[PDB]
Amino acid sequence: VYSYTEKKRIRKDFGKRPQVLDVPYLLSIQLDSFQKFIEQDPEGQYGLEAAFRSVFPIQSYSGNSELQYVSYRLGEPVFDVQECQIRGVTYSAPLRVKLRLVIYEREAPEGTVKDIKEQEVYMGEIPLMTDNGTFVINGTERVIVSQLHRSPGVFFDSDKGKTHSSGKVLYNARIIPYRGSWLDFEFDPKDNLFVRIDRRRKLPATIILRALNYTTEQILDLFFEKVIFEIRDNKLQMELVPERLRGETASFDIEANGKVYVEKGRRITARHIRQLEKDDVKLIEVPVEYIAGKVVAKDYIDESTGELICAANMELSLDLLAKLSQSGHKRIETLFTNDLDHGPYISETLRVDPTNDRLSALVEIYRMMRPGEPPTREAAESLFENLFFSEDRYDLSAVGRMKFNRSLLREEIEGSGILSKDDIIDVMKKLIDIRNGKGEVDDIDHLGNRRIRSVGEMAENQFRVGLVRVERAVKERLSLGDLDTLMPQDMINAKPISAAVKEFFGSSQLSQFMDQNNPLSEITHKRRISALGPGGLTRERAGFEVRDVHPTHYGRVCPIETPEGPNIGLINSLSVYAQTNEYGFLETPYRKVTDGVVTDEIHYLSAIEEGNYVIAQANSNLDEEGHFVEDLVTCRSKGESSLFSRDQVDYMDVSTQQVVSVGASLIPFLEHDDANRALMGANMQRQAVPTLRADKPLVGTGMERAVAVDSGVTAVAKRGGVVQYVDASRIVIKVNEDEMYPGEAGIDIYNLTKYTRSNQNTCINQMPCVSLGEPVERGDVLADGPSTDLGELALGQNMRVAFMPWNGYNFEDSILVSERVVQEDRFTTIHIQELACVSRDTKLGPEEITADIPNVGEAALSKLDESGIVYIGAEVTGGDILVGKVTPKDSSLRVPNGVSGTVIDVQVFTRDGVEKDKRALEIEEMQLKQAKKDLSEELQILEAGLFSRIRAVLVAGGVEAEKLDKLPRDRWLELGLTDEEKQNQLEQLAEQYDELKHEFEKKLEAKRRKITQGDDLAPGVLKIVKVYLAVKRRIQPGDKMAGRHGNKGVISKINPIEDMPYDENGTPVDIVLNPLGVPSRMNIGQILETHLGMAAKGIGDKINAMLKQQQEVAKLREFIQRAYDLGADVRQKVDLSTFSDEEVMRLAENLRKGMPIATPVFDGAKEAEIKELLKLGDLPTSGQIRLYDGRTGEQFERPVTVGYMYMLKLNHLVDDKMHARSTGSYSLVTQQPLGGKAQFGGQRFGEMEVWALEAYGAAYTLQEMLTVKSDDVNGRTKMYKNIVDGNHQMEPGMPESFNVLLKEIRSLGINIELED
Amino acid sequence: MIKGKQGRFRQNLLGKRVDYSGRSVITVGPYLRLHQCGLPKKMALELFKPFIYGKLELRGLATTIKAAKKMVEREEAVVWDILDEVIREHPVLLNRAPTLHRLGIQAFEPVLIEGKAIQLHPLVCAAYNADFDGDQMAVHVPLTLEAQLEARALMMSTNNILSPANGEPIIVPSQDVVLGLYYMTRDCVNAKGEGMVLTGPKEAERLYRSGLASLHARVKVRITEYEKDANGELVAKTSLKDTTVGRAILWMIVPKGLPYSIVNQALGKKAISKMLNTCYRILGLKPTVIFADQIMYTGFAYAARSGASVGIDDMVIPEKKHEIISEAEAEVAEIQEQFQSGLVTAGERYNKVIDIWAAANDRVSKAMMDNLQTETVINRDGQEEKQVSFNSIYMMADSGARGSAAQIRQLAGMRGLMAKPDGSIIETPITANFREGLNVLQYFISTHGARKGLADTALKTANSGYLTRRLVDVAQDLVVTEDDCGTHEGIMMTPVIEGGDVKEPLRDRVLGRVTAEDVLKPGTADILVPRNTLLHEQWCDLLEENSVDAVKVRSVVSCDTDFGVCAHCYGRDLARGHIINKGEAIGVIAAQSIGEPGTQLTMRSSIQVKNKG
DNA sequence: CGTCCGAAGAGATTCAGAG
DNA sequence: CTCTGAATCTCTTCCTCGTGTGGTCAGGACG
RNA sequence: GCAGAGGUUCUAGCUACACCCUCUAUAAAAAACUAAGGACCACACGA
Ligand SMILES: NCc1c[nH]c2nc(N)[nH]c(=O)c12
Ligand SMILES: [Mg+2]
């Protein structure tokens, strides 16, 4: 059983590995995140309501009043998504927040509030994510890429090597809050622990401990174990534990009860330790020497006077021992230091620490955090509390809590956002243990340590910033504001909260211009993850390690799809099967294995949970009972690939494609090609421009269906039904009655978007793929989008490829193309360029849009209308006038040179209060008529569905259907109908229809009035006319064309068809490629791709030959069935006996061009299968076909490789990149070339070029380029006169930039002058 | 504003944007000569617009300059004829976007082309280090007569045959022409036309076009080679030489001066580079330019006629590969058993696994080479005879056209051990070649190193740019100011030997360097080389015959010139094959020469005696 | 109608324990 | 016992060009 | 603009480097003469 599109054309699949989980919704990451951002959340977790609860307690300080958030309601959009794009306004929903303000009793907070003020206030306008997944923010679709940032929590870094220049590793502990100040503990070379906050100057680690109100004795107790020393007549023998002896050599005789277990100065062997436990003696004799070499852990005060014999953390001198002995301190508690196990890091810091109490510690903290500020008691306390113990200033997210607890081995999942004393002391203890070697440093590159912040979380954070701003405002206003006098709407200003969100959405490092260049590009950009942004790494800060891919990326982040450039690995693409966890971590679906059987149930595994388990290989043979065929299966356990027993492994890869992203998955035979070439090819696919005709990839992965359906370029069937009416503009489906809802339902109208200006200046064209009467099931693709063919993503054209070097035209990576390709318009692409002319309120009168321009050619005026706007569909050329803007007494917009084509549409926009001109009135009238026609059409189709349902049960009720037909069929209500089960529904339908006629008339009036009212415009502009220019760019020599495998090349020459090589059958090969790119750039897949394409076209040619003649349906059916079986345990095993003859005929007609092949990424076809498929056709199994030169007619030796490889034209057409200027506008620095193609600017002759001419003997050329071609107010003018006079004499002069330098340095205060 | 790249002195003063300049993508267009290039018709009209206006005024077609401006907008046929006249002899500088070396900017004679893309002659594409992957070249138009003469004299590609860094041809044929010549200059044991006697290379060409004899069949054909033994006189010698038909055909391309021995070999890439170097050394530069252009034309034509093609069946997977892999896996299992038994430690076991996997990789590579390079067995008028295999991929690798033996070993043999990004070698290598399907884990391991290499290459480019800038700035103020200092002091030049081998022969090191003093023969009191003589090829060979192991030579550090360098001390220009001319800026030349390879540079007992002596 | 309101490398900067 | 070399604390750079997209202050009354 | 004035045209046209013509109180007979405001920052891509 297959979907109708699949029935229309079913892709042969060579995948030998069954899939247990379908491809997840590719845009789920953005959609679900934004939905949770705006979803009403009753528990107030992960939503706008969470932010409202966190930021709106609003208890006025000394104001005995409170304003509390109640509920937030999203307002309906002012304009639709397409309307927002056209008008240029953002697609946003006004925020209706129910706010209740209560006033307590006079100076009685415990008293009940006297009255309430509950009302709804507009609080900013939040952009709405489209159903596609984008944001329209200034009339242009914008996609907010998800950010990969260091997960909040505690992380430990070695910082080994360069630090201390001695090989010693200086472990540091970093606690990164989600919001707040960083807390860093770092080790000194002298083993001194230092604390550093907010990357400021380092401070002794004891200082923060004192800020926790910890005494020195408490610090020693926390960070050190205490040995007990006992005063004895026998040289002060002390109680001791045998375990602490292990690991160090004894400096004394170990004797208890007169039995010397270990002698003086003897290394303690394992046997000695073991017998020490076996004796279980509590006291161990210690001489005066060993006790001397110790540091006391607690203060000991003499009994005589109470003064301390020893201060906390002071070395035990012999006289100190005598002083405490005469004092009588029998029990002595001193720190135990074992250089192997327990180092005196805390003790040494305490010695270095000069702040002996909490007061001095907070004084130091205040001085460091705010230098130059006189410290104060309360001020320092408040500063520290805000730094690390205030909820508003410092926040750890729930993900931060979980990561912190897991890193610190805490049992509880979540604690409190603010740091606690126990948390800090545990962090320090863990850092000490890492210093001792216990444990290991956390890995920053570990993907478990890097959580993904999606659009919802970022929007929540920016909304929180706006909320704290408005909270500051409202708390300042309320405190001094009159009670019960100002409404909350008066108290709340929506400007800051609106501005914060608008700034984040419109302009941010993560807020990016969506590239609509390709549906694949649209999908990839939405799923794309960038480490850049706020709270993230930059281009220069990031080192190699962050860019390098950590083996934990497997199944979460695509290794292959990383953009080439400065940002290599900073930007990554989400793997196809991955989806973010609740806490934001990446998860990979994995199949549970009980003992040997791979149970079909899938459990999503986090990166940290991936490490402990062992995961089976994707290419793991199965017995069809779930047991691994191989006794030992290759598996990855802890980032290491090693074979394991079949019983040992407990998880398996869900599918072979989970490693790659959406872009990489589309590449066929990706397994065979090198990783670098796969990366390049995946990058090229995004830049592929939609061709004039969308042609199915003759060879493809098979995921094109998923990309097309999940992308918004093509409309899908929300409800299955029959196609009532289909048009290029719009498609009408009549839904089946089961799909149809009982009331006001039965039709689904999809208004297909015609040629529209893409974000990358391409064309978004929605082409219907169905006709009348075709049964369309739910979820079916009604109309193909750009680069979409019958519901399959069609980025480019499958074109004939010959791998031979042809007269050097394909020299390094160049590509020949036959004139046949241009003749058939195979790669011709429509480009939409939008030119905007703005009339402005200028001085000495405003600019006049009316064609009052004088001193213009009559031919130019002819294209313009009476009002000066160019007629729709008038072909224009660069330099031709399009509008009639007149300088107030030549300012009219003209086509940019090198741009040509018909004007598809003119969207005149009028400011409110500005009268529309003749043409603008007509344009508005056309829009009003079109809106009226569309609303009348929607009413008519709604009426047709309503009439059908009413008629169906109109006969019931014992009234003749014909009598009701004589009455208006909708208004049968005048004729009484006996009550029946559906009579109430029919009465509701007719009453609703009568009310709907008024409501729809009001809706028509409102829609027309929206067009009639002058659109809001930027201030100071009377009107803006948006003229859309549409051009059919064709294949031009130098145009960049690339295959999916990364063999990028320019079109060297448009070779004539007869010159192109031809095989024995005489078919000329369309594209000739250099085979030398294959060996070095090891994209051997393109050769396999070419062979498989040849096999598919052989199948298609046999099908076409059967179709050209009149062949029995049984013969064609059996041949296509042979094609679709081909043995080799193919997963599909489709049976054509199910298909009807008409369905088989339609399938054959679709296959007449060729038979598509679904070759998955890593379970794709082997070479033997391709050989068998070639054998199915008449083609030689070798894949080499004898070829003849087109020009000479002489056969080539060594038969060449010929087959159809998918070919992509890239948007880097020569038309855009070609530029030149003789003379043009200059800048303020008087550098005559402005630079850039958009302005008439010249190429930068930079430092490298200067040194290049400098190494040569070039002096006159260098002087000329520097002076007369760049900056000389006199020389540039002179040289022009000399050249037009015919003599090439250069006046050197002095560059203007040098005078600029002189005046700037002289302004700086340095006397710089040119002395003679 | 004053300082940094953003700062004006770096931003504009050092590099000023220029008028009469333009960019476009690059196109091959082999039909062009080396000196000339392809220029778009529309681009030329904009670039040469002032020259066009002047020519129109001189013609009188435009009475006024305003009329001339209108005529250029009209683009009438008369304007295009005027453009042809201006384009005829105004050289255009062509500049690659990263100008690492002086060769990056080379002037060319512009030729009007219908296409909108600049065409660069194929031989000079290697010099530019540019490809056709949508590379873009800035094109500038020198204006003054001094500028045009400077361009034609020095900037033009024909002048810079040899790279400034090393006295070797920088126009060495790179990709397709070398493959075509290698197919042409190849021998087969048996092919149609074998054993024939041919009157001359013209007859060889006629037979090949008739198809009676293939390119690579051996025949007994006379060759009339002219010998330059008489200085400035050509002595014709005609002899019967047993060579292939293709080599005979290529002999027509070679000028008369060069000997026939150079063509008689396989003529790969180093071979053709040596051929060009010998042509430059023996004949003039202009004959060398004509020879190079003819080489490119013939190579492209015979490569196209050859029909070289890469295919899956062309790749050969050794039958011994699976057995070797199974033996290596059994050895690995044995080492794992030893580790479980405790005989070998974890580090020692890892080392042993790495060693055995490396040995297995070497054996797989050797078997693949044995079954790739000489695999073809061809009947030879009798018993079948093994011959060097004509496999296209092996032809590409052996000829040096593109891709070394390592790439082919990765292609058809097992890829081998791939180190994980930190630097440690993964215990389990990639046993699957690119022809076979790679496992997902294998692909992940490979992509580790691939991404590592890409990022390291990006930072290679960054650090190379920084180093080049620093070298230019430190060595900018170096120009040849004195013809001869006369400083007897100089550095001692000797071949460098680390004991294993002579890493640098003395011939290359002292080539084109003026002797510090008289070079006496190893025989005492015999002065082979005078005190101040430039060492061309003849002198360097003469020293080799007398086996002068140590030569004390002048160096730039030795010269006593202040704010300048001795012309004799610097030695040969290394690009024009003669003593450095006075006033040339050697400092920037050397800074660019050192900086440029930085992209290629990777960022990351018993005394055995080789031979008796 | 103006018009006021990372990384790395290197050179100072301590600083210091030692002959 | 007053300066060792040594640890520390700021300062400067970190390619080279294209091509497209976008977003933008100071500083509002006021006589 | 010989100095003052006006000027065909081929935006504007005794200076921008400018230039020329005719004429005697004020415009009108004629051809040859000449280059325009673009600052910064982010994102993405291509080499
Ligand atoms: N720039 C001077 C000028 C303005 N109008 C002119 N008309 C003519 N015939 N001649 C000129 O020289 C001028
Ligand atoms: Mg390139």
PDB file of C-alpha atoms in Angstrom, chain B residues 188-288:
ATOM      1  CA  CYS B 188      52.539  -0.931 -25.648  1.00  0.00           C
ATOM      2  CA  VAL B 189      53.978  -4.383 -26.288  1.00  0.00           C
ATOM      3  CA  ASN B 190      51.560  -4.998 -29.174  1.00  0.00           C
ATOM      4  CA  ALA B 191      49.349  -2.551 -31.057  1.00  0.00           C
ATOM      5  CA  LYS B 192      48.357  -2.014 -34.664  1.00  0.00           C
ATOM      6  CA  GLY B 193      51.197  -0.474 -36.642  1.00  0.00           C
ATOM      7  CA  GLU B 194      53.868  -2.088 -34.458  1.00  0.00           C
ATOM      8  CA  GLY B 195      57.165  -2.867 -36.162  1.00  0.00           C
ATOM      9  CA  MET B 196      56.667  -0.480 -39.078  1.00  0.00           C
ATOM     10  CA  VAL B 197      59.321   1.884 -40.422  1.00  0.00           C
ATOM     11  CA  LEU B 198      58.263   5.521 -40.770  1.00  0.00           C
ATOM     12  CA  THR B 199      59.868   8.211 -42.917  1.00  0.00           C
ATOM     13  CA  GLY B 200      59.417  10.920 -40.302  1.00  0.00           C
ATOM     14  CA  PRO B 201      57.271  12.384 -37.534  1.00  0.00           C
ATOM     15  CA  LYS B 202      54.990  13.833 -40.203  1.00  0.00           C
ATOM     16  CA  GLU B 203      54.411  10.293 -41.452  1.00  0.00           C
ATOM     17  CA  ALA B 204      53.754   9.209 -37.867  1.00  0.00           C
ATOM     18  CA  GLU B 205      51.060  11.873 -37.542  1.00  0.00           C
ATOM     19  CA  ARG B 206      49.544  10.887 -40.889  1.00  0.00           C
ATOM     20  CA  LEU B 207      49.450   7.209 -39.897  1.00  0.00           C
ATOM     21  CA  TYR B 208      47.833   8.065 -36.574  1.00  0.00           C
ATOM     22  CA  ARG B 209      45.127  10.174 -38.212  1.00  0.00           C
ATOM     23  CA  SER B 210      44.545   7.401 -40.744  1.00  0.00           C
ATOM     24  CA  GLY B 211      44.152   5.122 -37.732  1.00  0.00           C
ATOM     25  CA  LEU B 212      46.451   2.475 -39.209  1.00  0.00           C
ATOM     26  CA  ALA B 213      48.838   2.788 -36.247  1.00  0.00           C
ATOM     27  CA  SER B 214      47.854   3.685 -32.700  1.00  0.00           C
ATOM     28  CA  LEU B 215      49.547   6.442 -30.724  1.00  0.00           C
ATOM     29  CA  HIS B 216      51.431   4.079 -28.424  1.00  0.00           C
ATOM     30  CA  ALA B 217      52.795   1.507 -30.880  1.00  0.00           C
ATOM     31  CA  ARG B 218      56.580   1.313 -31.247  1.00  0.00           C
ATOM     32  CA  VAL B 219      58.064   1.898 -34.707  1.00  0.00           C
ATOM     33  CA  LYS B 220      61.492   2.394 -36.258  1.00  0.00           C
ATOM     34  CA  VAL B 221      61.394   6.019 -37.441  1.00  0.00           C
ATOM     35  CA  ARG B 222      64.266   8.350 -38.268  1.00  0.00           C
ATOM     36  CA  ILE B 223      64.469  11.551 -36.220  1.00  0.00           C
ATOM     37  CA  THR B 224      66.267  14.684 -37.401  1.00  0.00           C
ATOM     38  CA  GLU B 225      67.487  16.237 -34.142  1.00  0.00           C
ATOM     39  CA  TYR B 226      69.506  19.441 -34.222  1.00  0.00           C
ATOM     40  CA  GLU B 227      72.337  19.739 -31.710  1.00  0.00           C
ATOM     41  CA  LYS B 228      73.401  23.031 -30.124  1.00  0.00           C
ATOM     42  CA  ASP B 229      76.922  21.720 -29.429  1.00  0.00           C
ATOM     43  CA  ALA B 230      78.305  24.446 -31.679  1.00  0.00           C
ATOM     44  CA  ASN B 231      77.602  27.625 -29.723  1.00  0.00           C
ATOM     45  CA  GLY B 232      74.871  29.402 -31.656  1.00  0.00           C
ATOM     46  CA  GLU B 233      74.916  26.906 -34.539  1.00  0.00           C
ATOM     47  CA  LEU B 234      72.523  24.003 -35.093  1.00  0.00           C
ATOM     48  CA  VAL B 235      74.062  20.750 -36.340  1.00  0.00           C
ATOM     49  CA  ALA B 236      71.475  18.416 -37.839  1.00  0.00           C
ATOM     50  CA  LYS B 237      71.706  14.716 -36.964  1.00  0.00           C
ATOM     51  CA  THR B 238      69.386  12.103 -38.483  1.00  0.00           C
ATOM     52  CA  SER B 239      69.225   8.609 -36.997  1.00  0.00           C
ATOM     53  CA  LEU B 240      66.816   5.691 -36.754  1.00  0.00           C
ATOM     54  CA  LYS B 241      65.416   5.465 -33.228  1.00  0.00           C
ATOM     55  CA  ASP B 242      63.061   2.844 -31.805  1.00  0.00           C
ATOM     56  CA  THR B 243      60.241   4.962 -30.379  1.00  0.00           C
ATOM     57  CA  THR B 244      56.473   5.014 -30.138  1.00  0.00           C
ATOM     58  CA  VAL B 245      54.356   6.705 -32.788  1.00  0.00           C
ATOM     59  CA  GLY B 246      53.038   9.179 -30.232  1.00  0.00           C
ATOM     60  CA  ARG B 247      56.520  10.264 -29.183  1.00  0.00           C
ATOM     61  CA  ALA B 248      57.360  10.732 -32.859  1.00  0.00           C
ATOM     62  CA  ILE B 249      54.300  12.957 -33.288  1.00  0.00           C
ATOM     63  CA  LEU B 250      55.227  15.051 -30.253  1.00  0.00           C
ATOM     64  CA  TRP B 251      58.724  15.486 -31.688  1.00  0.00           C
ATOM     65  CA  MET B 252      57.289  17.914 -34.243  1.00  0.00           C
ATOM     66  CA  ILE B 253      56.175  20.142 -31.366  1.00  0.00           C
ATOM     67  CA  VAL B 254      59.682  20.165 -29.876  1.00  0.00           C
ATOM     68  CA  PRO B 255      61.987  22.772 -31.464  1.00  0.00           C
ATOM     69  CA  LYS B 256      65.107  21.723 -33.316  1.00  0.00           C
ATOM     70  CA  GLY B 257      67.568  22.549 -30.540  1.00  0.00           C
ATOM     71  CA  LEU B 258      66.381  20.075 -27.925  1.00  0.00           C
ATOM     72  CA  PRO B 259      67.645  16.469 -28.050  1.00  0.00           C
ATOM     73  CA  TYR B 260      65.314  13.574 -28.776  1.00  0.00           C
ATOM     74  CA  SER B 261      66.137  11.704 -25.558  1.00  0.00           C
ATOM     75  CA  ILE B 262      63.795  13.904 -23.510  1.00  0.00           C
ATOM     76  CA  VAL B 263      60.744  12.916 -25.559  1.00  0.00           C
ATOM     77  CA  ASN B 264      61.694   9.233 -25.655  1.00  0.00           C
ATOM     78  CA  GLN B 265      60.635   8.748 -22.027  1.00  0.00           C
ATOM     79  CA  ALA B 266      57.150   8.455 -20.546  1.00  0.00           C
ATOM     80  CA  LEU B 267      56.890  12.265 -20.145  1.00  0.00           C
ATOM     81  CA  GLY B 268      54.926  12.585 -16.932  1.00  0.00           C
ATOM     82  CA  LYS B 269      54.924  15.785 -14.863  1.00  0.00           C
ATOM     83  CA  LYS B 270      58.467  16.027 -13.516  1.00  0.00           C
ATOM     84  CA  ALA B 271      59.578  14.891 -16.974  1.00  0.00           C
ATOM     85  CA  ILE B 272      57.710  17.684 -18.756  1.00  0.00           C
ATOM     86  CA  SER B 273      58.950  20.201 -16.188  1.00  0.00           C
ATOM     87  CA  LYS B 274      62.517  19.096 -16.918  1.00  0.00           C
ATOM     88  CA  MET B 275      61.767  19.359 -20.638  1.00  0.00           C
ATOM     89  CA  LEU B 276      60.596  22.955 -20.237  1.00  0.00           C
ATOM     90  CA  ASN B 277      63.602  23.794 -18.065  1.00  0.00           C
ATOM     91  CA  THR B 278      65.987  22.361 -20.662  1.00  0.00           C
ATOM     92  CA  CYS B 279      64.193  24.270 -23.415  1.00  0.00           C
ATOM     93  CA  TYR B 280      64.540  27.532 -21.496  1.00  0.00           C
ATOM     94  CA  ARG B 281      68.202  26.838 -20.720  1.00  0.00           C
ATOM     95  CA  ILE B 282      69.230  25.882 -24.255  1.00  0.00           C
ATOM     96  CA  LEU B 283      66.946  27.961 -26.491  1.00  0.00           C
ATOM     97  CA  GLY B 284      65.603  31.464 -26.051  1.00  0.00           C
ATOM     98  CA  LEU B 285      62.574  32.430 -24.013  1.00  0.00           C
ATOM     99  CA  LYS B 286      60.430  33.000 -27.112  1.00  0.00           C
ATOM    100  CA  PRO B 287      61.108  29.472 -28.461  1.00  0.00           C
ATOM    101  CA  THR B 288      60.302  28.239 -24.956  1.00  0.00           C
TER     102      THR B 288
END
